[PDB]
Structure formats: C-alpha cells, structure tokens
Amino acid sequence: SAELTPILPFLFLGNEQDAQDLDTMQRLNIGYVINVTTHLPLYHYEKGLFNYKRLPATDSNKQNLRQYFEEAFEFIEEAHQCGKGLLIHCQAGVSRSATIVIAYLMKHTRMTMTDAYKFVKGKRPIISPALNFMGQLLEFEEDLNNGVT
Template sequence: MVTTEPLEIDSCQLMHLLVEAQKRPLVLDCRSFLNFNASHIRGSHNVYCNSIVKRRSKGAITLDCILAEESVRAGLRGGRYHTVVVLDERSLGFASLTGDPTDKLVLSTLLSQLDAHSVHTYFLKGGYETFHSLFPGMCTQIAKPCPQGSPGESPVFRSTPLYDQGGPVEILPFLYLGSAYHSSRKDSLQSLGITALLNVSSTCPNYFESTFQYKCIPVEDSHVTDISAWFREAIDFIDSVKSSGGRTLVHCQAGVSRSATICLAYLIHAQRLPLEEAFDFVKRRRGVISPNLGFMGQLLQFETEVLCR
C-alpha cells in the first residue's frame, strides 16, 4: 500500500515542466518494454518490474529493482531531480489503478524511499496516450523495419540470402544486430554511427581493425557450445562502448543464432526482461533470428539467474 498518495499532473502541466522548468523532471514510463521502444516521451526512462519482483514485493521495493540505470538512481539520491513523473498507457488518475500494476508499485517505492520535501512525485493523468495525442513532437517514433524480401524487388536482391538483406537493425540506440556481410560494409557502419563490432564467431574476419574497435567471441553455432560462458564479457564490452558514447554491432556469420543470443542475453541483463519478451522484441526487428536449442536453454538459465537475483 502507498502510505501517501502521489500528486497528479496533466499533460499540459508536464509539457510546461519539460520546456520551462530549470531542472528537467525525471519521467518514468511504466509501459511494456515493447511499447516504450515503439514510442515514448523524449528523455523518459522505462521501468520494468518482472513478475518475480512483483510477487516478492510487499507494497514497495528498492530503487535498484525499478531503475536499471545506475546514473538515474544516483541522480535521484543525489538531488539532481526535484520532480518525478510516473506514467502508464492511459489511466485517468491514481485512484483508477486497480490490482497490482507496475506504476502503483513504482509510486509506492518512490514515496517510501525519497524525501517528499526535496523530490515531488506525480502521476500523469491520461497517461502516454493523452500526452502523445497533444504533443506528438515531444515523443520519439521508432520507424518499423522494412519487410525483407518484399514484392517488387530486383532479381539480384532476391538471390541474396535473407539474413544478408537490408542492413544492421537497431536493438537499442547503442546496440545493433546483423550478419558478417553487414560487418563488411564500412560506409553503412559509419552512417549508423557504429564504433565497435562484437564478432561472435571463430571464422568471420575483422575487416576494418584500423577504423573500429573489435572484440571476438570464438564460438561455433552448435547446441553443445557453452555460449553463456561469454555473456558477462560480451555485456561488459557493450556497456563500455556505450559509456564512451559509441555504438556496437553484434554479428556472427548470418546474424541468426550466435549474435542474436548475445543480444538477447544483453536485454535480459540490462533491461531485466523475461526471455520471451526479449525474443519478441528482437524478432520484430530482425525476423530471421533463431538461436539453436542449446543456446535457448542457456538463455532460460540466464533469465532465471538474473530475474531471481
């Protein structure tokens, strides 16, 4: 239960804060990871509470459980934010929340752990749906990837393997997934702002070592390969490139099994997503992904370790 109900704010008031306030408010979006990445208020942060956390909570949890980004947690505790706004898809107000939704748990956590005199916590009336309808220019809109192998393409394009068609796909703003062919196209990599490549194979060459940062994970696409032994190293590499302002392309030969597995492991760890949701998210962006059964079993084990922790 929330000991003190949060204040409420409407879309126009939030817009005023985003534009006029001396200190920009922290906007916490409690919608699903898929919906958030399809479109969200610029500068907002997605919070996600998996089912295990919800079952174990007693009305409030720690900030670490709802905010994956350490810098945001530090900012909340260090006084960087004077205002926090929590939103969902379309709830009319705090009183309309029923059951145990994520936003109610997030609000409970904020109200119990933050000093109400220094940080004001608000709930957005009408949610993202209303804000987006009024101020679409303040929201991001992720373009849907073009369908691969679409009718009307040239015979040359049709002869190209499906996994090499198009280019690398954006998984997160700093993380891309593709094939070895995509890793060989220097102009394309540079146009996407990619600065590092994570080569998940023992045979694919590193084409441009004088231009990009490389890391190799020399594994085979076999159900007996222990790719999970490399998860931590791969995640640290992606994070290190991100922290330096760069972007990483993860690839193997086809961008179907090995590199997709690494991207799924990263989403499970960094976003605390269940494997099923992470898989759906990546599949929508790169429809050809298909980790082998051995890799899927290792991802399930990794999901258990991460989410239970």
C-alpha cells in the same frame, strides 16, 4: 539478405556482410564490433577504425555461449558509456549473435526472456537461436531472477 537491425540506438545486430560495410558503420557512429565466431575475419581490422572483440564460438549444439555474456555486455556498455554504437554479428545474425543480444536485453533492460526474444524477433524476424542457446537463455533467466549472475 536481411538488413542490419537496430536493436537500440547504439546496438545493431547484423550479419557478416554488415560487418564489412564501412560506410554504414561510420554513418551509424559505430565504434565497436563483436564478432561471435571463431573463424570469420575481423573485417576492416587493419584500418584501425573500430574496437573489436571476438567471442570465438562454434555453431555446435554443444557450444557454451553463457560463458561470453559478461564480457559481451561489458563491451556494449563501454560503447554506450562513451557515446558510440556497437555492431554485433555472426555469419547471418540468426543464432549466435542474436542470443547474445537477447541476453543483453534480459540483463540491461530487465526483459523476461520471452519479451526479449519477441523484442528482437519483431525487429529482426530472421532470428532463430538454436535450441541449446534457447536453453542457456532460460537458465540465464533463472539466474537473473535469483541473483546468481
């Protein structure tokens, strides 16, 4: 499988196996986890090492992920303002979780959607957001550029 991907020093985009790797997470000072699926476990939850957030998306071509952007970004920013890293993952780290990361970069570093996509794709060549997620990213780009959330 692909390696866990540092996106920023406090933001890592990875897969379900990355989400089980306690050693790495503690090494990277990761205190927060976003699990972008409805059905995977919150790995290591009972250890009470991390602050977890489930974004219970299905990988269906109807899924709305825009719905979760605001809340995802608040949790990343909570991790950042307190000096910890955040791991965000789905099963493989290719579509659902990669879309949130791209959206966070468009919002919090004002990258265009193309530039944010190429930024993530350069660091994690695995990514391939589903077309309906690509559609939601373009609409979020319009919304960001007029002041509509």
